[PDB]
Amino acid sequence: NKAMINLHIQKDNPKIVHAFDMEDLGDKAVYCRCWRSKKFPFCDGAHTKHNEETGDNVGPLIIKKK
Amino acid sequence: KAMINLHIQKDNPKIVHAFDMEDLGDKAVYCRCWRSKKFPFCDGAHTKHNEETGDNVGPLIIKKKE
Ligand SMILES: O=C(Nc1scc([C@@H]2CCc3ccccc3C2)c1C(=O)O)c1ccccc1
Ligand SMILES: O=C(Nc1scc([C@H]2CCc3ccccc3C2)c1C(=O)O)c1ccccc1
Ligand code: FES
Ligand code: FES
């Protein structure tokens, strides 16, 4: 608990928060929780490379319809 | 040691959560910092993380439209 989690994303914003209306989502949204996506706040699979390199076990959050 | 998640479910090699819109309330707030004691939900722990590390991470909000 010394290192930043986010290294590069919107560093002029002092607290990055995203808010979406569930009515605006498609059938599925896949959100990044690793701060390595080139499509942040969406997951683009960059968590696998992170986990591979660091031995971590992070992954995305999926919001979907039943 | 450049891991993002330090302590959460470390017997799981890739932590992914998936929720159905239909089961959510008016507002669900999800943790993107891996420091919440209520993970995958946000409990405010990101502020302490940001202050300690100089980071700027925060949660993902899924809500019903106005
Ligand atoms: O890691 C990625 N996606 C992941 S990881 C886990 C899911 C879960 C798996 C099971 C599952 C079961 C029921 C309903 C949804 C899901 C989704 C998904 C997904 O639906 O995309 C990824 C990789 C490269 C580019 C973009 C995204
Ligand atoms: O609604 C919640 N949090 C919200 S709503 C808006 C913010 C941000 C937005 C950006 C921002 C930018 C600079 C300074 C403050 C803020 C506030 C936050 C936050 O957590 O920091 C919530 C948290 C835990 C449980 C339940 C609800
Ligand atoms: S790219 Fe960050 S969780 Fe998938
Ligand atoms: S406790 Fe992790 S984003 Fe709020």
Residue numbers in the entry:
A (entry chain B): 41 to 106
B (entry chain A): 42 to 107
From the paper:
M1-mNT structure determined by X-ray crystallography at 1.65 Å resolution shows the presence of an extra density that correspond to M1 molecule on each mNT monomer; monomer A and monomer B (respectively). According to the M1-mNT structure, M1 is in close proximity to the [2Fe–2S] cluster binding domain where the tetralin ring of M1 is oriented toward the [2Fe–2S] cluster while the distal phenyl ring is facing the β-cap domain. The M1 carboxyl group forms a salt bridge with Lys55 (2.2 Å distance between them) but it does not interact with His87 (3.5 and 3.7 Å distance). M1 is also oriented towards the side chain of Lys68 (β-cap domain of mNT) and forms a hydrogen bond with it (2.9 Å distance). Moreover, the surface of mNT and NAF-1 show hydrophobic residues facing the hydrophobic moieties of M1 (<4.5 Å) suggesting hydrophobic interactions between M1 and the mNT/NAF-1 protein. M1 binds strongly to the Lys55/Lys81 in mNT/NAF-1, respectively. In the native protein, hydrogen bond formation between Lys55/Lys81 and His87/His114 (mNT/NAF-1), is critical for cluster stability with His87/His114 in effect performing a gatekeeper function which is compromised upon M1 binding to Lys55/Lys81 to result in higher lability of the bound clusters. Previous studies indicated that Lys68 mutagenesis (insertion at this position) destabilizes mNT’s [2Fe–2S] clusters. Taken together the structures of M1-mNT/NAF-1 strongly suggest that in addition to His87/His114, interactions with Lys55/81 and cross-talk between the β-cap and the cluster binding area are also playing an important role in mNT and NAF-1 cluster lability/stability.
